[PDB]
Amino acid sequence: MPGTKRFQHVIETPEPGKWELSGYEAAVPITEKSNPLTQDLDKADAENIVRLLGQCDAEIFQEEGQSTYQRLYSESILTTMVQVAGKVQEVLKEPDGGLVVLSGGGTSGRMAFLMSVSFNQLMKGLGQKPLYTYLIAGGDRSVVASREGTEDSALHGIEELKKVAAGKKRVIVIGISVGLSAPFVAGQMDCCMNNTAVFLPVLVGFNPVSMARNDPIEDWSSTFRQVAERMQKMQEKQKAFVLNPAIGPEGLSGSSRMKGGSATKILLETLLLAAHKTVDQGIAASQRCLLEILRTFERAHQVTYSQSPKIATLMKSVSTSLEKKGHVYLVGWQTLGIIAIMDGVECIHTFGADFRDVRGFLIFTFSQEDFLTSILPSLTEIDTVVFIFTLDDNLTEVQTIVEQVKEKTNHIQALAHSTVGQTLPIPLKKLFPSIISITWPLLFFEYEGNFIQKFQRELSTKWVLNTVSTGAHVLLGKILQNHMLDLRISNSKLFWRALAMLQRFSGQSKARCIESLLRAIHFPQPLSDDIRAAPISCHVQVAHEKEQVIPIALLSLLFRCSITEAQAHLAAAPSVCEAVRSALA
Ligand SMILES: Nc1ccc(S(=O)(=O)N2CCN(c3ccc(C(O)(C(F)(F)F)C(F)(F)F)cc3)CC2)cn1
Ligand SMILES: O=P(O)(O)OC[C@@H](O)[C@@H](O)[C@H](O)[C@@H](O)CO
Secondary structure, eight states: OTTTGGGTTOOOOOOTTOTTTTTTTTTSOGGGSOOGGGTTTTTOOHHHHHHHHHHHHHTTTOOOOOOOOOOTTSHHHHHHHHHHHHHHHHHHHOOTTEEEEEEESHHHHHHHHHHHHHHHHHHHHTTOOOOEEEEETTSGGGGGSOOGGGGGOHHHHHHHHHHHTTTOSEEEEEEEOTTSOOHHHHHHHHHHHHOTTTEEEEEEOSSOGGGSOOSOBTTBSSOHHHHHHHHHHHHTTTSOEEEOOOOOOOSSTTOTTTHHHHHHHHHHHHHHHHHHHHHHTTOOOOHHHHHHHHHHHHHHHHHHHHTHHHHHHHHHHHHHHHHTTOOEEEEEOTHHHHHHHHHHHHHHHHHTOOTTTEEEEEOOOOOHHHIIIIIGGGOOTTOEEEEEEETTSOHHHHHHHHHHHHHHOSOOOEEEEEETTOOOSOTTOOSSSSOEEEEEOOOOOOSTTOHHHHHHHHHHHHHHHHHHHHHHHHHTTOSBTTBOOSOOOOSHHHHHHHHHHHHHHHOOOHHHHHHHHHHHHHTTSOOOHHHHHSOHHHHHHHHTTOSSHHHHHHHHHHTTOOHHHHHHHHHHSSOHHHHHHHHHO
């Protein structure tokens, strides 16, 4: 009928109690699943939250069980990492007309960028011409902006890839898509496979290829799945690679900026860094070289989360300022500044939060006085300001800005990375009572700017800020179990996530859920046959513009009532969250 093929991939809602037996749950990609550790995340207190997310993040390093999915430390994955290091080496050997592209949408795009800078530094440090570049969905703008809608075009991905691949002779394209989902990457990988002579595609994400996305893409004929299955066949001739360890679901379902983006760095820093370091040695990269690095990253988690109580406290101070109407400033230097910006921006689409709510800053890119003059006066009793640096930074720029802020505000916890026995000027730097002191062992490093210390630190900061930003909002009651129900539908993936949440929470048929959603989106216009049959991009473009789409749609279903009736109920309840939870009751 009208809309049958648009919605064909959607599995029917199972009956009460048979979610397993129907096998609907077997087809939910690992990346979208509900993480059982966080079933009650919306009841956890701050310290619980930090523990549950610490646990979730730990799952990245968990090893393979005895009929089950390959993981980071499984031999197949490390062997693929080794082969890829190899191919990166051939390019490094012969940089003339060589290029290495790291590409993704959203947080995969952000991760791509950091890493292309890092490995560009590393080659500058050795006086080699930089061979790395990034590509992000929607151009460079996207690195530091919330722009969730730009991932949905395969021709845009191919366009962007054709720009930077110029008249290069040998190009490595690392397509990063956590969910093995983004149309932006799918076209790139497919294009590479059509010109092997020049391109080598390497696909990175965290689902088995059997769970790769498989609904049609509006500007492209193949699906992500087909593209990935065909890359996997090519791997046997070593002309494509798929690097896809399971890392377990996200503690907030489908919030792939968290574990997904973490594991992206872990996986890609590790392997690239191996390729470089072993290329100067005239040795092949080996599982043993990768393992040293992976184990360092695994220590980095333990190191990071041992500071848990201070993490729960910072969370509680971020949650408080938001619970009033304050604002949160993440102030950090060099790449940890960026990471802070990245975190704050991602809270907009992730939690429906305003850009002032949690906002990052680098010394978005403001100077010492500049921040003192412009941003400083706007601060207030109820806010929180977070400072993020190493002892190697310029603590005379640091101490100044804190002095200033300690006046206009008092909540000013802070995040300081140190190699052991660095001290921390001003013993009267009880400007911060009990800092988040993270001190790193000494470790070997032959390269110039100590790249492995950078990677550790960036990851540990990412983990802290993510757990913080995410916990603060959970505490405010905005998360339903371990799902963000009331999200903004701004891309096709988010539209499927919405439809999925409608089925799960209502228990009602696929057809009713779809109808309640489309009515909610297009109200006041009734359901027509054109609307039923529209490409999903038409629903997205209309929903993106509205508020409470999903909660309205869910109420209409639970109450078995019209959109006019559910909007009126909603507006009569004290709050969205209360309207929904009590309707669910
Ligand atoms: N690899 C991929 C990635 C995305 C897609 S998708 O965009 O078509 N869609 C994403 C959301 N998705 C989904 C999300 C959440 C659920 C849930 O059922 C649960 F519990 F599993 F999270 C929820 F309750 F959230 F709805 C179920 C399915 C199914 C597939 C398909 N394959
Ligand atoms: O890497 P994927 O699966 O292609 O996801 C790409 C982006 O949608 C994703 O990074 C998203 O922006 C984040 O808000 C998810 O928390």
